[PDB]
Design an enzyme around this catalytic site. Structure first.
Site, PDB file in Angstrom:
ATOM      1  N   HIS A  28      12.350  64.921  15.448  1.00 14.25           N
ATOM      2  CA  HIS A  28      11.056  64.525  16.052  1.00 14.25           C
ATOM      3  C   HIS A  28       9.714  64.981  15.445  1.00 14.25           C
ATOM      4  O   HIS A  28       8.856  65.531  16.149  1.00 14.25           O
ATOM      5  CB  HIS A  28      11.034  64.709  17.579  1.00 14.25           C
ATOM      6  CG  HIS A  28      10.003  63.854  18.267  1.00 14.25           C
ATOM      7  ND1 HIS A  28       8.647  64.116  18.191  1.00 14.25           N
ATOM      8  CD2 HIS A  28      10.130  62.739  19.033  1.00 14.25           C
ATOM      9  CE1 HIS A  28       7.985  63.200  18.883  1.00 14.25           C
ATOM     10  NE2 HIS A  28       8.861  62.353  19.404  1.00 14.25           N
TER      11      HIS A  28
HETATM   12  C1  LIG Z   1       4.791  75.682  15.704  1.00 17.91           C
HETATM   13  C2  LIG Z   1       5.916  74.841  16.242  1.00 17.91           C
HETATM   14  C3  LIG Z   1       6.253  73.655  15.592  1.00 17.91           C
HETATM   15  C4  LIG Z   1       7.291  72.858  16.075  1.00 17.91           C
HETATM   16  N1  LIG Z   1       7.606  71.687  15.420  1.00 17.91           N
HETATM   17  C5  LIG Z   1       8.652  70.912  15.840  1.00 17.91           C
HETATM   18  C6  LIG Z   1       8.952  69.743  15.160  1.00 17.91           C
HETATM   19  O1  LIG Z   1       8.297  69.446  14.171  1.00 17.91           O
HETATM   20  N2  LIG Z   1       9.999  68.951  15.546  1.00 17.91           N
HETATM   21  C7  LIG Z   1      10.729  69.291  16.668  1.00 17.91           C
HETATM   22  O2  LIG Z   1      11.669  68.583  17.003  1.00 17.91           O
HETATM   23  N3  LIG Z   1      10.410  70.432  17.386  1.00 17.91           N
HETATM   24  C8  LIG Z   1       9.376  71.257  16.976  1.00 17.91           C
HETATM   25  N4  LIG Z   1       9.050  72.420  17.663  1.00 17.91           N
HETATM   26  C9  LIG Z   1       9.856  72.826  18.864  1.00 17.91           C
HETATM   27  C10 LIG Z   1       9.347  72.142  20.117  1.00 17.91           C
HETATM   28  O3  LIG Z   1       8.076  72.669  20.389  1.00 17.91           O
HETATM   29  C11 LIG Z   1      10.231  72.448  21.326  1.00 17.91           C
HETATM   30  O4  LIG Z   1      11.599  72.426  20.980  1.00 17.91           O
HETATM   31  C12 LIG Z   1       9.983  71.461  22.459  1.00 17.91           C
HETATM   32  O5  LIG Z   1       8.668  70.959  22.393  1.00 17.91           O
HETATM   33  C13 LIG Z   1      10.191  72.176  23.789  1.00 17.91           C
HETATM   34  O6  LIG Z   1       9.751  71.350  24.838  1.00 17.91           O
HETATM   35  P1  LIG Z   1      10.093  71.698  26.371  1.00 17.91           P
HETATM   36  O7  LIG Z   1      10.609  70.444  27.030  1.00 17.91           O
HETATM   37  O8  LIG Z   1      11.067  72.844  26.509  1.00 17.91           O
HETATM   38  O9  LIG Z   1       8.694  72.069  27.055  1.00 17.91           O
HETATM   39  P2  LIG Z   1       7.429  72.476  26.168  1.00 17.91           P
HETATM   40  O10 LIG Z   1       7.155  71.467  25.085  1.00 17.91           O
HETATM   41  O11 LIG Z   1       7.687  73.836  25.586  1.00 17.91           O
HETATM   42  O12 LIG Z   1       6.236  72.538  27.234  1.00 17.91           O
HETATM   43  C14 LIG Z   1       6.178  73.607  28.146  1.00 17.91           C
HETATM   44  C15 LIG Z   1       4.938  73.491  29.024  1.00 17.91           C
HETATM   45  O13 LIG Z   1       5.082  74.324  30.159  1.00 17.91           O
HETATM   46  C16 LIG Z   1       3.848  74.951  30.430  1.00 17.91           C
HETATM   47  N5  LIG Z   1       3.986  76.220  31.168  1.00 17.91           N
HETATM   48  C17 LIG Z   1       4.321  77.448  30.656  1.00 17.91           C
HETATM   49  N6  LIG Z   1       4.318  78.342  31.673  1.00 17.91           N
HETATM   50  C18 LIG Z   1       3.987  77.710  32.821  1.00 17.91           C
HETATM   51  C19 LIG Z   1       3.835  78.162  34.130  1.00 17.91           C
HETATM   52  N7  LIG Z   1       3.345  79.387  34.295  1.00 17.91           N
HETATM   53  N8  LIG Z   1       3.497  77.245  35.102  1.00 17.91           N
HETATM   54  C20 LIG Z   1       3.282  75.920  34.790  1.00 17.91           C
HETATM   55  N9  LIG Z   1       3.428  75.493  33.485  1.00 17.91           N
HETATM   56  C21 LIG Z   1       3.774  76.374  32.515  1.00 17.91           C
HETATM   57  C22 LIG Z   1       3.208  75.175  29.078  1.00 17.91           C
HETATM   58  O14 LIG Z   1       1.805  75.237  29.189  1.00 17.91           O
HETATM   59  C23 LIG Z   1       3.679  73.964  28.299  1.00 17.91           C
HETATM   60  O15 LIG Z   1       2.702  72.942  28.314  1.00 17.91           O
HETATM   61  C24 LIG Z   1       8.018  73.237  17.202  1.00 17.91           C
HETATM   62  C25 LIG Z   1       7.679  74.432  17.846  1.00 17.91           C
HETATM   63  C26 LIG Z   1       6.636  75.231  17.373  1.00 17.91           C
HETATM   64  C27 LIG Z   1       6.314  76.507  18.102  1.00 17.91           C
HETATM   65  C1  LIG Z   2       0.386  57.775  21.294  1.00 16.47           C
HETATM   66  C2  LIG Z   2       0.926  57.227  20.003  1.00 16.47           C
HETATM   67  O1  LIG Z   2       0.478  56.221  19.482  1.00 16.47           O
HETATM   68  O2  LIG Z   2       2.024  57.905  19.333  1.00 16.47           O
HETATM   69  C3  LIG Z   2       1.769  58.802  18.242  1.00 16.47           C
HETATM   70  C4  LIG Z   2       2.877  59.852  18.050  1.00 16.47           C
HETATM   71  O3  LIG Z   2       2.880  60.842  19.109  1.00 16.47           O
HETATM   72  C5  LIG Z   2       3.767  61.968  18.939  1.00 16.47           C
HETATM   73  S1  LIG Z   2       4.318  62.577  20.535  1.00 16.47           S
HETATM   74  C6  LIG Z   2       4.993  61.597  18.095  1.00 16.47           C
HETATM   75  O4  LIG Z   2       4.662  61.872  16.720  1.00 16.47           O
HETATM   76  C7  LIG Z   2       5.679  61.703  15.683  1.00 16.47           C
HETATM   77  C8  LIG Z   2       5.201  61.549  14.272  1.00 16.47           C
HETATM   78  O5  LIG Z   2       6.870  61.692  15.957  1.00 16.47           O
HETATM   79  C9  LIG Z   2       5.394  60.136  18.346  1.00 16.47           C
HETATM   80  O6  LIG Z   2       5.680  59.930  19.747  1.00 16.47           O
HETATM   81  C10 LIG Z   2       6.905  59.199  20.092  1.00 16.47           C
HETATM   82  C11 LIG Z   2       6.822  57.774  20.566  1.00 16.47           C
HETATM   83  O7  LIG Z   2       7.979  59.774  20.011  1.00 16.47           O
HETATM   84  C12 LIG Z   2       4.264  59.209  17.861  1.00 16.47           C
HETATM   85  O8  LIG Z   2       4.435  58.887  16.470  1.00 16.47           O
HETATM   86  C13 LIG Z   2       5.537  57.965  16.213  1.00 16.47           C
HETATM   87  C14 LIG Z   2       6.643  58.366  15.281  1.00 16.47           C
HETATM   88  O9  LIG Z   2       5.530  56.881  16.775  1.00 16.47           O
HETATM   89 AU   LIG Z   3       6.881  66.726  18.741  1.00 12.19          AU
HETATM   90 CL   LIG Z   4       5.915  65.286  20.562  1.00 14.44          CL
END
Ligand SMILES: Cc1cc2nc3c(=O)[nH]c(=O)nc-3n(C[C@H](O)[C@H](O)[C@H](O)COP(=O)(O)OP(=O)(O)OC[C@H]3O[C@@H](n4cnc5c(N)ncnc54)[C@H](O)[C@@H]3O)c2cc1C
Ligand SMILES: CC(=O)OC[C@H]1O[C@@H](S)[C@H](OC(C)=O)[C@@H](OC(C)=O)[C@@H]1OC(C)=O
Ligand SMILES: [Au+]
Ligand SMILES: [Cl-]
Ligand SMILES: Cc1cc2nc3c(=O)[nH]c(=O)nc-3n(C[C@H](O)[C@H](O)[C@H](O)COP(=O)(O)OP(=O)(O)OC[C@H]3O[C@@H](n4cnc5c(N)ncnc54)[C@H](O)[C@@H]3O)c2cc1C
Ligand SMILES: NC(=O)C1=CN([C@@H]2O[C@H](COP(=O)(O)OP(=O)(O)OC[C@H]3O[C@@H](n4cnc5c(N)ncnc54)[C@H](OP(=O)(O)O)[C@@H]3O)[C@@H](O)[C@H]2O)C=CC1
Ligand SMILES: NC(=O)C1=CN([C@@H]2O[C@H](COP(=O)(O)OP(=O)(O)OC[C@H]3O[C@@H](n4cnc5c(N)ncnc54)[C@H](OP(=O)(O)O)[C@@H]3O)[C@@H](O)[C@H]2O)C=CC1
Ligand SMILES: CC(=O)OC[C@H]1O[C@@H](S)[C@H](OC(C)=O)[C@@H](OC(C)=O)[C@@H]1OC(C)=O
Ligand SMILES: [Au+]
Ligand SMILES: [Cl-]
EC number: 1.8.1.12
Lengths: 488, 488
Positions: free
Chosen positions: A461
């Protein structure tokens, strides 16, 4: 019997060479490989290696990569890459200079392959048929030239490939082809590519990148939509995108008369009845098999569709020992196809166990300024002989092009399914990094694949390919002929 | 029961939102989505969107794309793109400037989603549990602060994800993380990233691209090889290539003391015992689940390995109605996984028909200066519990880098099969266009694929992905746990 060589291959083709090598290495059978010249060259273009190695995929991809930078350089400006972009054009000479040296280098490894390999032997000239087991080598294509070698063989493989089709037009010989394009002394300012096939669109891109400051590239085509035989939505979005990149496309237009000028630049008479001025003019009309000269007649080898070699699915011609592969057969004209055709032939006759080249579901690509990648069937052709067909579409603007300024670089995927089956019958992609994606797609398709595979695989992703798995709700249907969102 | 809200999700996560949105739209159930703040934020970093929408995959990739241009600008010159080579450096400001305006924009389309979608509701503040049906909303993580809203629900979903793991060391609070990294006022000259995980390597790349003139980026890591848990050969080649791109890697080295200097710059004490000066210092140590503050203790939600939420295969916890997905569970930390996790959960309870997320053979990628793409098993792990295992390797220099002057940019593929079966158990790739390729590869591996399936697919022939079908002969074998070539 017990002849001088086991195989005489006419042409060191992508498939020719593949066939020759394998036979000599995996089977030790003595092979003689005939071809026109040593290294890639302007006098007679296609040499040892293939119309692909010398004047095809290699120099093409190189040049397209060079031309790609133009966009990339402008694009980085939005990424804080400040530099003097003031009227900055590329140097054509340094490109060809570095292109030649890389191709030349490839021909050098080839020479040194023959030196190392036993069974193999390279024979330089113009090969022709004498009869069933005798291949003559002459120094000219002209069949009244000096007899150079006379090769006595068990089997004959024809892999002489394809050649630029001219058009029956006064001034035709003022036009350059895909062959000559590669060795142009200089970059063209006023550029006219002629045609609507791979070479047209791909080269359109190149010259556009390598235009000297102020230049332009017009693209003309006999019919109303470019690239006949592609997802009719992909075709449109590309024609639009070529526009936005500076290539003036032009449908339902064709030249009728061409005359050379005072400063040497070429003058052109069009279908609509205009006159325009172009430094160069390239013809991407198509490719006839290169079998005019071979005298297939004198050995009883079947010649039909303007000389295409009649073969069965095992590449066997009208005589039981002479074979032909690649463009000369004129089924599927690609490098990895003839390569497969050559290996199939090797296993069929020398390998003992036969095997036929699977022409159904071959993924290929188009190397235009935005690259296309398809595998399988069009909507038009799936709804042709399939009862119920689903069509899925999805087009998104990659997240980087918001910053880069190229908000026109819409990446596009199209999937075509069998509603009765779920079966994935065709996938079509337009955008950067497509030709890579599609390659694995065709691994899934020749494996037999269903959309219920595609979507039910977890994504990677931050990419473009991951959007293949996001397609559940179809865009529309094709019911035994006509588009519909049908019921009952 | 008729409780107020059907679902309260703690956190508008990539998975949280997905699950939320799904329930509200496809099943009309009333959903309330709690999260910390409005748009991506330098005080409280994550926001409505996710830790990857706001401070992850999006801003990350943009920056990686920006840094990439450095190579591309140098490379183009060999393609006849002559410019002011004269040590021109990137403008960090204009990048973050365009970065924010792009992220900030995404949160604006998110607020507009909530306004437009019915059943959905965003609640701002820090969520916590009172009991199995009551979610409290506080304005601080501090459970002593103000009570803002009290929400009554059938189901709770924990999606609070993960947070920077610091190291227990003096000077720790002088360090920046992945979170703070994104909002740095200025581009660091003297840069140190600490660790050898996804973040470390990817960010090493960025700052290396976005270093002002003269700057250097060092990389240190506790152990002797970076990126524990990738194809042990890929890891090596990457560690080499980072060298070539200008990143000074360092192994078996770890900081112990950090002290802030006269000019603001940070001083560092190492394991080898040296002292070095750095403008900044980033810690890519990992990510512990964000469940400390949640008060699971009160509601009886199982809390184990660093607080990670105990869940079953259907994402259900100790209580029959509280669920958790994504990084808080600590199974597989990726965006498309939590998305899948959330999607399955929706079907599991609201969708009637249950379904479990398939964690086995998920393709993912690492967005380093050369990008990695893997799917399936390592070399070591196949020979662990698989009988006889083959290894196919292939390392080629793409044809274009002969001109670009980046002869160090080797592309790499590694396929791992079950010798008994012929089954493809793991594919590993390093190089440009890897992550795009790997995605469709993983469609082949959840489908179940064999190396026979691979090679017998025809190629797309000027590309990199087509070298997947060029692998017939294994490089060497692993027989019940040892590097071997045969049986006797
Ligand atoms: C720098 C970085 C780069 C990354 N790049 C990639 C990538 O390129 N491709 C990929 O597949 N994955 C990537 N990841 C991993 C990805 O971020 C996670 O695996 C995924 O987004 C986790 O999503 P989630 O559903 O667990 O919730 P999250 O996306 O972690 O969202 C959690 C939300 O809960 C909220 N929250 C926290 N505490 C509370 C509370 N007190 N009360 C209410 N809300 C709260 C937070 O504000 C946050 O908005 C990356 C991670 C990091 C750190
Ligand atoms: C609001 C808007 O136009 O979408 C832009 C991007 O938002 C982010 S969340 C993601 O980016 C990337 C590079 O993965 C992807 O979302 C989805 C749909 O997963 C969209 O890009 C792509 C691949 O479509
Ligand atoms: Au993402
Ligand atoms: Cl995303
Ligand atoms: C500009 C261009 C770009 C292309 N790019 C791609 C691409 O990107 N990807 C792709 O898959 N395909 C590409 N192709 C198609 C590809 O070049 C052909 O389909 C493929 O090379 C056909 O190979 P072949 O085995 O039939 O023999 P060829 O590769 O065509 O070689 C034929 C050989 O026979 C020799 N020969 C001819 N006449 C005689 C005779 N008188 N006696 C002895 N030898 C003779 C020729 O000199 C030549 O060396 C491209 C084609 C062109 C024209
Ligand atoms: N895989 C790759 O990246 C590449 C592969 N190749 C291979 O080599 C082949 C080379 O053939 P190519 O030259 O590109 O063209 P094509 O064989 O793709 O088709 C010719 C195009 O020119 C038009 N045309 C044909 N005759 C005339 C005429 N008399 N006047 C005006 N227009 C005309 C045709 O229109 P219409 O639709 O009316 O027939 C058609 O659109 C390709 O088909 C492909 O197999 C070539 C380059 C790149
Ligand atoms: N898909 C993508 O593009 C991305 C995904 N992610 C996800 O989020 C997670 C973020 O974690 P990340 O920060 O990248 O690193 P990880 O959680 O993958 O691993 C931590 C790394 O730092 C080392 N380390 C751990 N503790 C210390 C310490 N105390 N001192 C020195 N070194 C230490 C570890 O060494 P050792 O091997 O000895 O334990 C290991 O190499 C990843 O697991 C990944 O799932 C993150 C970024 C990008
Ligand atoms: C020995 C050598 O390294 O180079 C040979 C190249 O020949 C050309 S035919 C091909 O080019 C391309 C880019 O497809 C590819 O061939 C194959 C092996 O299919 C090789 O390129 C490379 C390295 O991919
Ligand atoms: Au080729
Ligand atoms: Cl080739």
């Amino acid at each position: 019997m017990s002849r001088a060589y086991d195989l005489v291959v006419l042409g060191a083709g992508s498939g020719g060479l593949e066939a020759g090598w394998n036979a000599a290495v995996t089977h030790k059978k003595k092979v003689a490989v005939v071809d026109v010249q040593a290294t890639h060259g302007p006098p007679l273009f296609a040499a040892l290696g293939g119309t692909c190695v010398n004047v095809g995929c290699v120099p093409k991809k190189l040049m397209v990569t060079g031309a790609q930078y133009m966009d990339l350089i402008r694009e980085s400006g939005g990424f804080g890459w400040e530099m003097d972009r003031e009227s900055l054009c590329p140097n054509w000479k340094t490109l060809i200079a570095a292109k030649n040296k890389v191709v030349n280098s490839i021909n050098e490894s080839y020479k040194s392959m023959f030196a190392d390999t036993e069974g193999l032997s390279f024979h330089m000239g113009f090969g022709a048929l004498q009869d069933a087991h005798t291949v003559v080598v002459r120094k000219s294509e002209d069949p009244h030239s000096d007899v150079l070698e006379t090769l006595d063989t068990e089997y004959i493989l024809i892999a002489t490939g394809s050649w630029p089709t001219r058009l029956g037009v006064p001034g035709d010989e003022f036009c350059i082809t895909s062959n000559e394009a590669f060795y142009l002394e200089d970059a063209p300012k006023r550029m006219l590519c002629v045609g609507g096939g791979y070479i047209a669109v791909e080269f359109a891109g190149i010259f556009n990148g390598y235009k000297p400051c102020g230049g332009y590239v017009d693209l003309c085509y006999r019919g109303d939509l470019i690239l006949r035989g592609f997802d009719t939505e992909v075709r449109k979005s590309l024609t639009k995108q070529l526009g936005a990149n500076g290539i003036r496309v032009r449908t339902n237009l064709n030249p009728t008369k061409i005359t050379k000028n005072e400063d040497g630049s070429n003058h052109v008479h069009f279908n609509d009845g205009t006159e325009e001025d172009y430094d160069q003019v390239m013809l991407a009309i198509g490719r006839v098999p290169r079998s005019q000269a071979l005298q297939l007649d004198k050995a009883g080898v079947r010649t039909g569709k303007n000389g295409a070699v009649q073969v069965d699915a095992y590449s066997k011609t009208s005589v039981d020992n002479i074979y032909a592969i690649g463009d000369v057969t004129n089924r599927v004209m690609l490098t990895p196809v003839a390569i497969n055709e050559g290996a199939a032939f090797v296993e069929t006759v020398f390998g003992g166990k036969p095997r036929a080249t699977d022409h159904t579901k071959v993924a290929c690509a188009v190397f235009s300024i935005p690259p296309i990648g398809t595998c399988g069937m069009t909507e038009e052709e799936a709804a042709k002989n399939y009862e119920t067909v689903a069509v899925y579409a999805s087009s998104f603007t990659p997240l980087m092009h918001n910053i880069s300024g190229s908000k026109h670089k819409e990446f596009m995927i199209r999937i075509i399914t069998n509603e009765s089956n779920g079966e994935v019958l065709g996938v079509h992609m337009l955008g950067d990094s497509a030709p890579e994606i599609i390659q694995s797609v065709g691994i899934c398709m020749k494996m037999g694949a269903k959309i219920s595979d595609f979507h039910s695989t977890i994504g990677v992703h931050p990419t473009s390919a991951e959007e293949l798995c996001s397609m559940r709700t179809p865009a529309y249907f094709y019911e035994s002929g006509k588009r519909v969102e049908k019921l009952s």
